[PDB]
Amino acid sequence: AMKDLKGTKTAENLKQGFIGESMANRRYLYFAKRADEEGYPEIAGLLRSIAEGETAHAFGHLDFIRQGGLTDPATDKPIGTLEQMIESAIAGETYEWTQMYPGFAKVAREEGFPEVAEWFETLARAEKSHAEKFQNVLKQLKG
Amino acid sequence: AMKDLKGTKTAENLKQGFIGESMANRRYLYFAKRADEEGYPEIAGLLRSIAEGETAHAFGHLDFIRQGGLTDPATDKPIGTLEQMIESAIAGETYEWTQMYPGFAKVAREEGFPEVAEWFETLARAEKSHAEKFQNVLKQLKGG
Ligand SMILES: [Cl-]
Ligand SMILES: [Cl-]
Ligand SMILES: [Fe+3]
Ligand SMILES: [Fe+3]
Ligand SMILES: [Fe+3]
Ligand SMILES: [Fe+3]
Ligand SMILES: [O-]
Ligand SMILES: [O-]
């Protein structure tokens, strides 16, 4: 591996860089769909290509995070081995279905946004399904 | 009014949901590559399929954000129209190349991590290129 990054500002900067690059890929693919609808195929293709750049950037941030002994930006769990990667996926999905999306749904209903609440409730059930499927993966890797 | 979400906690939750879903898709595609190398194609395929779920979630969050008159989670700029979307991309990439990545690179060098610094410098130049390409897009939308 590489030099230990724990405790540095660079460790936090890699995390923040990963967050921004992740958002950018999602944003640019969403924007490309609007270009698609409106008939701007060269713009849409450029947006998709820039999005591939942001993928490369996000993955490179993860490379340095993993090689520097740091944890997953999303879950604060190690992601050195495949088993650890799956354990990180389980931890994040579990946070999302047990805490995050149910709370978002409750708040949306309290604030008078039942349609948004229904979306958050759909997502809560979806993340529970994801968590169960990843748990099945881990069981198979450890057997 | 679901069409005016400004200032509500639900607005903040949509933003945070978008951030988490965006990271999840990137993480699961990265993890899939390790499964690929090691010969676990069913695990890799599951990671890729779940990642498509996280794409749908992120895009749905953006749908509610736009429909509610809220701004881009990354830039705090409106993203209703295509021109606005491109203007948001320009603002974010400009921040990344003029401030964010150069600052990250300086810190990495000062902390004794030259390989990470070089990566941040490569990314700074890349985001400058991205900003210029988005600027060209805006020129084309405006008539160029
Ligand atoms: Cl075009
Ligand atoms: Cl497999
Ligand atoms: Fe980037
Ligand atoms: Fe999830
Ligand atoms: Fe999700
Ligand atoms: Fe960028
Ligand atoms: O980026
Ligand atoms: O998720």
Author numbering:
A (entry chain B): 0 to 142
B (entry chain A): 0 to 143
What does the paper say about this structure?
SulE lacks the characteristic C-terminal, rubredoxin-like FeS4 domain of ruberythrins and contains a binuclear metal centre that coordinates iron and zinc when isolated from S. tokodaii. The exact function of SulE is unknown, but it is presumed to be involved in reactions against oxidative stress.
Diffraction data from a crystal of recombinantly expressed SulE reconstituted with iron (diFe-SulE) were collected on beamline BL14.1 at the BESSY II electron-storage ring operated by the Helmholtz-Zentrum Berlin (HZB). The beamline flux was set to 5% to minimize radiation-induced damage to the metal centres for initial characterization. The crystal diffracted to 1.42 Å resolution and belonged to space group P63.
